[PDB]
Symmetry: C4
Subunit: 282 residues, 4 copies
């Protein structure tokens, strides 16, 4: 039984034409060492280009060796960074018109760097933990499939949403083995304030694709369970999310999630995450 | 005589707002405005020093050229040292010009940032819709795919039927009918997604045919939204179709093939292709 | 009949204790001339304070008249703005330790200014026009209350929401004249793409507080109709909104909104907003 | 033995993450980290010039003090002129130190901005709830008010009943019941808003009394959200109550009085006051 979705929810599927006009997407998605290099490489090339302009207009930099690329590059660097030490200064109106434009490039050039830097950083992780496996035990009468979610950080999550999806290959009346996504109704699909742990539950009633399906049936149909958390974290005043996927083998039947809440020796209620993935039997 | 273009924009010809206009203009036009505003502010500040003292050291007195380039180095905080202010009159404007170039840069980064953090959704739409039997019932279909490795969270498609009809009150107009999709929200959208509208009793296309849709100038509007993982931002895309854009009895070719190694790939070359009859 | 809500939707109601710890709210809400002044005044006071520190540590500025506040202020200004002309320079380690901290103040001080500037600006107006008055005419059988909304800008609005609310004073079983807000169901409460004009409609059926209420009844009960538009504008990639309120007198019965769409002499369909507030009779 | 505090935080004691930690720490601790990181970077760059050439002009050779203050003026782009680099070794680090202080400022503005654009909602909650007859039926009530002139758009209140109960499976736990308010969303919230929960057949408080709620350790959680006009940002507030926080048969005193001139005012001094019996 092949697995289509990874444990992180990513679809393990290649796409043709790996193969820049999507630059803004590329700039935000490349790694930080590559991003620092791109800004570094762009910075030296941009200073190397302005240097030639000072050399092409003639020796218009005092205290600069005529025709020396370094002094023009290091006057550009001192002009681009607005250091303006004082030894190397421009001469006449033409050099200053090249300096007044270079400073304009320095102002706008920094802002685009600040923009790219800012947008790359404000991507806060949700900081929520998923249960290693799913369990199906009776709850309030019906047999209920359930998985757990823990908030690792102290700050609470507002408007917490959970979306449990069963992805499974079925056959239609036409007669094709296509992949179909089923929404699994939950006892609770919205938690106003998510502080600690949230045990998501799917009652298996008349309205459930899992109804009447044994352990062998889920495995032989390549059944997988896609999970999506969404909320508004208080720590960032920003929206955060998390995804995860289970397979038919990762569900254990008759399992009972061990109580995460314990009682400390002192006499205060506490939360032990060491028993978050623990499961009991009945 | 089409009301909606294929991109979603309305065909109807429309017969200060500074903040909107700033982000509206193109990137070259935006770069020009900063330059002009930067030069004029430096030109005005040059006329300031010249029109109240003429204290710019190591510079031709009365020459605006030396004053503009001192104002530049002062607003651009270069401070070479050759051109230096003299007396309280120049030092007062130096303090003000500095306060100008600092607030002036912050507004520059503010406008630049707001213009680039408006990312495209990167979603491809089918060039046509198919009306065929899915599990017996005839269902109107159109599919979309993701053109980026990153996934879109909480993806919502909205399919709207735009057509011209006559009310009981005797006035003809154009109403927008919300089509009921089998799935209105996909929690994780990473590859391709086929959107289906079952044509049942409570369906505005129910009873219609190839001709009746065209005769009423029926048009179909699609709206996709979702939280893109690449940008940590809500992205959206739009598309529209007409009656002549539907191919009855069509089926979208399966875009999921298999590589020689054994890897499952997304064949987006067969995304717009549609075979008729049964397949 | 007194009016509680203004035409802009603002509640015309004073609140006690006009009467800073809510500074962040104050900084964003004060007017721009006041905001520029606050940053200006903070800038001079901050440069005047650093100047005294250079004077209190002793004459440690070359080419500066000893004990002169201006030269210390204008060295601070040249140090705060990082101009560094060259005549006025610090002397010894103590002056430079005061300069290395002043530059740190200049970096952080600019960012807070840039932050306040940015947050004050990214408040885009929705750019949507409301109909001057409401009309109640028959539509699809039932008598339907309706008002119009026009998109002034070219860019379309995504996920456009309209919330029509009837605010009215009623009496409960206890016997109190309180204000009550009624949600008026609409034929359409959501427009995926808002390009041009949107005619909101409230059918007056069995589920409507306006049902069985004449013109005289709405006026004698101080009835008002609060309207809220909400959407995601394409021009800003940001959420925009608008509010508005009508009164019982602003509704005209039997009115028929004149068609906003016309036909140009050329032969193309066009949209004339000159007849947006026009109303016909039947 | 209270599970939720009056602010909404859970009482349960909990038994790198750099980006979260940066915004988490207090404002004084945040200012310190920049200073330390700024000094150490200048100290490292000073050791750079000294450890490869010693070319800082007009400075005591081998003295770290003169090198730190040159590195500062170079990273802080002051460029007085007395201390100037000499040769390619210093000019190369000057170019790099400049690239550092420029990327270093941009991350500084990035972290500062993210920390202040997290505004408080500015919403006051009632210190207690009342269960009284509104239009006959007994309705649980709690009200909130806006402490700012600016209005909140699309305001949503969420009232949740937290209590400990036993399942049919014989295990005792704590379930969260969503209370059904008469109004879950207020489009425009500018003054005061009274939230009511009618106790009907489908109500978890139905049949309960003053004692049964306390005996089951019942607690009430409230969550307010909305789009504040002052910040153009979504603000939220939270609050919680216990069984002992309810006053049965109580009524909130009307907060809308009248001024001598004739103006209608919002009397927030009588916001928490509640009269019993009938009023
Ligand atoms: C089910 C609601 C989850 C609430 C999370 N909690 C407050 C218990 O930590
Ligand atoms: C029907 C559900 C369609 C969801 C598509 C999921 N996807 C294949 C894109 O990962
Ligand atoms: C009712 C839907 C409003 C649509 C707005 N429109 C596209 C016509 O300009
Ligand atoms: C019941 C509806 C309550 C909405 C309150 C409106 N307000 C008085 C705050 O403007
Ligand atoms: K500078
Ligand atoms: K400088
Ligand atoms: K200098």
């Amino acid at each position: 039984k092949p697995r289509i979705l990874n444990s992180d929810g990513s679809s393990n599927i290649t796409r043709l034409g790996l193969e820049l006009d999507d630059h803004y997407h590329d700039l935000l998605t490349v790694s930080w060492p590559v991003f620092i290099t791109l800004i570094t490489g762009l910075y030296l090339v941009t200073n190397a280009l302005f240097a030639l302009a000072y050399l092409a207009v003639g020796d218009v930099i005092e205290n600069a060796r005529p025709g020396s690329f370094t002094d023009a590059f290091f006057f550009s660097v001192q002009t681009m960074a607005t250091i303006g030490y004082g030894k190397l200064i421009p001469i006449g109106p033409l050099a200053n018109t090249l300096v007044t434009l270079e400073a304009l490039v320095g102002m706008l050039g920094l802002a685009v760097a600040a923009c790219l830097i800012y947008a790359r950083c404000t991507r806060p992780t949700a900081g929520v933990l998923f249960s290693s496996r799913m369990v199906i035990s009776d709850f309030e009468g019906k047999p209920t499939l359930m998985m757990r979610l823990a908030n690792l950080r102290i700050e609470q999550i507002i408007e917490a949403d959970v979306h449990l999806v069963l992805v499974r290959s079925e056959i239609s009346q036409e007669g094709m083995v296509f992949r179909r996504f089923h929404d699994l109704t939950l006892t609770r699909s919205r938690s106003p304030i998510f502080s600690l742990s949230w045990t998501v539950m799917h009652p298996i009633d008349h309205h459930s694709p899992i109804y009447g399906e044994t352990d062998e049936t889920l495995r032989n149909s390549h059944s997988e369970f896609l999970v999506l958390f969404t909320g508004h974290h208080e720590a960032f005043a920003q929206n955060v999310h998390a995804r995860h996927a289970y397979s038919s083998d990762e569900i254990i039947w008759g399992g009972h999630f061990v109580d995460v809440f314990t009682t400390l020796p002192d006499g205060r209620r506490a939360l032990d995450l060491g028993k978050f993935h623990e499961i009991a039997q009945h």
